[PDB]
Amino acid sequence: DAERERAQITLASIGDGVITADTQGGISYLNPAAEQMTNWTLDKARGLPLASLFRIVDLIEQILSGEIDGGREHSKLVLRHDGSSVPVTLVGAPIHRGAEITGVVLVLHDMTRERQYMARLSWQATHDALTGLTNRREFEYRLQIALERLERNSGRHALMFLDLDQFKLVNDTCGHAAGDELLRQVCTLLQQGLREGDTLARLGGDEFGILLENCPAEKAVEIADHLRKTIQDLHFTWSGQPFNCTVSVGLVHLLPGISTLEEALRSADMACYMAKEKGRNRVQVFHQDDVELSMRFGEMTWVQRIHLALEEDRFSLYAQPIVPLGEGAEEGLHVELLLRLRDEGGRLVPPLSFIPAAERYGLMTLIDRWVVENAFRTLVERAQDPRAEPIGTCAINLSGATIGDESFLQFLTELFARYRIPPQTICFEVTETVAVANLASAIRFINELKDTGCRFSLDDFCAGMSSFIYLKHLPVDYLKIDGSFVKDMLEDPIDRAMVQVINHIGHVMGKRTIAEFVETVEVMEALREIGIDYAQGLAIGAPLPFSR
Amino acid sequence: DAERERAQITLASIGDGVITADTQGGISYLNPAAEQMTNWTLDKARGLPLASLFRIVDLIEQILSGEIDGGREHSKLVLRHDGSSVPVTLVGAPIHRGAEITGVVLVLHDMTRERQYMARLSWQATHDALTGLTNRREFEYRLQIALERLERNSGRHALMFLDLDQFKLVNDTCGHAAGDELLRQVCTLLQQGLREGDTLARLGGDEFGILLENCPAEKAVEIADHLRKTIQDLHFTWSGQPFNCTVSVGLVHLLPGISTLEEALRSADMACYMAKEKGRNRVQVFHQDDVELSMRFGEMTWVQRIHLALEEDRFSLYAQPIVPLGEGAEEGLHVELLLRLRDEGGRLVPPLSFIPAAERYGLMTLIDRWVVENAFRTLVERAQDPRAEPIGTCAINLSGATIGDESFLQFLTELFARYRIPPQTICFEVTETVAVANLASAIRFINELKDTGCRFSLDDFCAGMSSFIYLKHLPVDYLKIDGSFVKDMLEDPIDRAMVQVINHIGHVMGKRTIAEFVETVEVMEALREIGIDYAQGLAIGAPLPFSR
Ligand SMILES: Nc1nc2c(ncn2[C@@H]2O[C@@H]3COP(=O)(O)O[C@H]4[C@@H](O)[C@H](n5cnc6c(=O)[nH]c(N)nc65)O[C@@H]4COP(=O)(O)O[C@H]3[C@H]2O)c(=O)[nH]1
Ligand SMILES: Nc1nc2c(ncn2[C@@H]2O[C@@H]3COP(=O)(O)O[C@H]4[C@@H](O)[C@H](n5cnc6c(=O)[nH]c(N)nc65)O[C@@H]4COP(=O)(O)O[C@H]3[C@H]2O)c(=O)[nH]1
């Protein structure tokens, strides 16, 4: 029928190569994109076998009907038979007649064409890949325009920082794929509650940004409380299991002309942190003098609380083993160090409660200098026993405060002299986020320490081009695959490939990989099969006391 | 007919949303990917108008048949009418019956899905986007494996660095799109001449890398000379105009176990530079003592040549104006400074001949200290005339040598005191490549200088995610759109969009843009329309003498 013309136009409109072949070989259809890719017109290629023209290699034109893919892209090369290869990502599917497998269809994507997609490159640079909302790049730009513009600048604006109180919980509990959905659902929820001419963004992690251009002070708080209540009223469930979904809002009434971008962002960040300190699931409006004193007070509260904890010897160190998945691998003992604080009452405080508050008020350099010294102090005390299990590696986490700290190296040279621990045994751990936050400083730090004999590790690493662009400049020795991927790796196929990608690129960049959150032997065997170097988790070993 | 089942399966296999509608509105077809995207089954959406269901916005379902796109993707949003937007890149095409425009077809791509493509992310990180060959990441990794491996390491390997002698010429003359084709053609040409188990890469720019694992010394040179002759025998033509296409090969006979990656790459780079110094279109085999003395000799030759040129006052400075495209924009005079050397004979030497040789032997810090001092010296001499055209901006190019040079700031503080030129007037210029080469150092440099009052500019900038990732960390004030894009912008549609992308993202990152190589008023008007801030080129003003 002439309905073929409609179908032919549709397939011609599509950018990807479309090859339709018979169950044995012979070509049925070729869209112009496939005709171009294969160097063969359908006029002169119809009925001729696929393999006896060009070649799809790394024979293959049978596993589609048998057992392979079913949606997952696979890297292949179209050997033209004259003008060499065309790099493609294949998608195969069997052509049926109910049960009768009559042929096979292939969806080929030219990896060379990627470079040409401009409207897509322009989008990604102005939007978050996951949510589809504007990113910090575009958001700060939009905020700056709102603060300097001459036209449409009659009223006052409103800036909100909305932190999803349960994002880490969902993500760590259910896996990366779950927390991505929670963010994907919270996005549309805020999107529903926002008028036209309003900027909604994801400024990273669990944080979202709202810009309310030309909005009165009352309306601005009324809108905030509503979005806060609607996230609270949102019932989030992952594989039937429900989550107590809620958000911490920080509001800033902005003024165009007199207020600045740095002040605007720093003010919304103070007020947001305040809603969290004031118990989470709260809106907090910024005020320059009053309810700003709360930060001045909080500084003194935490200076005293952290210092008291150091003099009262309330901090203790725990050790969690990291083991090689390598076949018959010996090596020394490898452990990561985990900090534990015991409150005045005598209860173990998890790092959730004090580390962010000690990060905010700038007391982390202290905690790091305390941790490193006690890790060396404990290593000497352990060394006293001849029969004791020798430690080949000892991973210690460093804050952005320490990376910025110019006096740290001297302190470490002083620690190495005093305790005589070999540098090689030590492996400092910095998170990909912390490194990118102060990029120049992380590089300069990493190199100064690597030259001392120490080792480096890039904790909580998530694959993407940016991360692999950053990884080029960070001379780390190891890569800690973010546990959220390792959690539901055997459940969601995207996270299994996300682990698979970190491993290959990690190895290509000459880095040994570590999988975090390896809770089950089944997970461990999955990672061993993939070729992950080390496993850390509950199936390996739980944190046990290191210090006294 | 039942051929609909074949077509339905094909459209279901495709990842992108496919909406087929009537000339007025009503829906004809929806693939499951479009059904998912639009929140409507074809069972319950057939015949109902497109606009009276969901909405494609920033009405639109008519310009496809009229006049718009014809292949170019356009950013749009599918407003679900219940669960807000889905970010997409649209491709429209009219459905015909010869002349009878019966309907319309739309190809929608979910920008959220981009994040999920893993096989594609893994590829891009191990391959060059343009050529499709392995990148430096993968190539160095493959080389390292070849130097340490226990299995398949009986023989000796061969490393080649093949520099395309005319790549800059084609690119500058014809435009970016031409030099990309030349590289695309040279790729398949080397690909044709390479056996199975051989690594062919593009280690950037005009440079390609060849790894010949387990190959005898004779065969290795025989293969080199052949690939050299076949590139020479390649007839390259752009829009009918032919180019004298040829390559400079540098060969290194590698040994697995005793030889190292750093040595391997540095040796192939020395021998390659040598084929260029020995007149280009040559293969050059590396030898540790003999024909290595040529580098020791070349150091002395250029130490003498550059120093002689400084004491003989043979170097002179030229000024090229950069003008704003801004409507009724005044400002001071903006100029870029260009270095000119006059050889012993009295002939103007173009920077092509001495800058790479003075970069290699490390004499650039010298030339930069000479340039900056004479730019300030000339500015004072110009200032002596009251009626003289005042200079508001003066752009000066800095080498990676100067960026690495810790004593430069002191030198500049010394120059500012001595000549009394205000820092604000000065705009130092560093190329995106030079910055990324020593990333930590460029950031630390840029910031130290920006704090002095100076300005910064990122010369020869090419849009891509990596460049926009780097641009985040480089606090430059301006962006010099690579002239190769500006050259054939009104000819190839990809380069017009490549200019368009740099401008928008550049402005989003709060940077003023400059277009290089603005040869015609027509080009200038094109860039003005796009919203480019400044234009530099022959239509604006040619380089005239600045110094004496
Ligand atoms: N669900 C699950 N969890 C597992 C499993 N195995 C280990 N874990 C948990 O994973 C965390 C490992 O630490 P991290 O991700 O590097 O993340 C660290 C690090 O970000 C920070 N931290 C801890 N100590 C220090 C320190 O001394 N200095 C600095 N700067 N940060 C520290 O706090 C976090 C440690 O908190 P912990 O409560 O010790 O949390 C530990 C541990 O309780 C598992 O199989 N399943
Ligand atoms: N086809 C075409 N070309 C145009 C047009 N307008 C200007 N040009 C050319 O574009 C070049 C501009 O310099 P650049 O791209 O920054 O690139 C610079 C820079 O990379 C380098 N350079 C020059 N002076 C210095 C210097 O003093 N120090 C350092 N480190 N590098 C320098 O050498 C290059 C300058 O070489 P020049 O021969 O002066 O080349 C000049 C100029 O001749 C046009 O409309 N059409």
Coordinates of N, CA and C in Angstrom, one line a residue, chain B residues 139-149 153 156-159 161 211 252-270 286 288:
Chain B
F139 N 44.9 5.6 24.5 CA 46.2 5.3 23.9 C 47.3 5.2 24.9
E140 N 47.5 6.1 25.8 CA 48.5 6.0 26.8 C 48.3 4.8 27.6
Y141 N 47.1 4.4 28.0 CA 46.7 3.2 28.7 C 47.1 2.0 28.0
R142 N 46.8 1.9 26.7 CA 47.2 0.8 25.8 C 48.7 0.7 25.7
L143 N 49.4 1.9 25.6 CA 50.9 1.9 25.6 C 51.4 1.4 26.9
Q144 N 50.9 1.8 28.0 CA 51.4 1.3 29.3 C 51.2 -0.2 29.5
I145 N 50.1 -0.7 29.0 CA 49.8 -2.2 29.0 C 50.9 -2.9 28.2
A146 N 51.2 -2.4 27.0 CA 52.2 -2.9 26.1 C 53.6 -2.9 26.7
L147 N 53.9 -2.0 27.7 CA 55.2 -1.8 28.3 C 55.4 -2.7 29.6
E148 N 54.3 -3.2 30.2 CA 54.3 -3.9 31.5 C 53.8 -5.4 31.4
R149 N 52.9 -5.7 30.5 CA 52.3 -7.0 30.2 C 53.3 -8.2 30.3
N153 N 54.3 -10.5 25.0 CA 55.4 -9.5 25.1 C 56.8 -10.1 24.8
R156 N 59.4 -6.5 20.2 CA 59.6 -5.1 20.5 C 58.5 -4.3 19.8
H157 N 58.0 -3.2 20.5 CA 56.9 -2.4 19.9 C 57.4 -1.2 19.1
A158 N 56.5 -0.4 18.4 CA 56.9 0.8 17.7 C 55.8 1.9 17.9
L159 N 56.3 3.0 18.4 CA 55.4 4.2 18.6 C 55.7 5.2 17.6
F161 N 54.4 9.2 16.1 CA 53.7 10.5 16.2 C 53.6 11.1 14.8
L211 N 50.4 2.7 17.4 CA 51.1 1.7 18.2 C 51.1 0.4 17.5
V252 N 59.6 5.6 17.3 CA 60.4 5.1 18.5 C 60.2 3.6 18.6
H253 N 61.3 2.9 18.6 CA 61.4 1.4 18.7 C 61.3 1.2 20.2
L254 N 60.2 0.7 20.7 CA 60.0 0.5 22.2 C 60.3 -0.9 22.6
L255 N 60.7 -1.1 23.9 CA 61.0 -2.3 24.5 C 60.1 -2.6 25.8
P256 N 59.4 -3.7 25.8 CA 58.5 -4.0 27.0 C 59.4 -4.5 28.2
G257 N 59.2 -3.8 29.3 CA 59.9 -4.1 30.5 C 60.9 -3.1 31.0
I258 N 61.8 -2.7 30.1 CA 62.9 -1.7 30.4 C 62.6 -0.3 30.0
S259 N 61.7 0.0 29.0 CA 61.3 1.3 28.6 C 60.0 1.7 29.4
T260 N 59.9 3.1 29.6 CA 58.7 3.7 30.3 C 57.9 4.6 29.5
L261 N 56.6 4.7 29.9 CA 55.6 5.6 29.2 C 56.0 7.0 29.0
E262 N 56.5 7.7 30.0 CA 57.0 9.1 30.0 C 58.1 9.2 28.9
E263 N 59.2 8.3 29.0 CA 60.3 8.2 28.1 C 59.8 8.0 26.6
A264 N 58.9 7.0 26.5 CA 58.3 6.6 25.2 C 57.6 7.8 24.5
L265 N 56.8 8.5 25.2 CA 56.0 9.6 24.6 C 57.0 10.8 24.3
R266 N 57.9 11.1 25.3 CA 58.9 12.2 25.1 C 59.8 11.9 24.0
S267 N 60.2 10.7 23.7 CA 61.1 10.3 22.7 C 60.5 10.4 21.3
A268 N 59.2 10.0 21.2 CA 58.4 10.1 19.9 C 58.1 11.5 19.5
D269 N 58.0 12.3 20.6 CA 57.7 13.8 20.4 C 59.0 14.5 20.0
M270 N 60.2 14.1 20.4 CA 61.5 14.7 20.0 C 61.7 14.3 18.5
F286 N 64.0 7.5 16.2 CA 64.7 8.0 17.4 C 65.9 7.1 17.7
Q288 N 69.0 7.2 20.9 CA 69.3 7.8 22.2 C 70.5 8.8 22.2

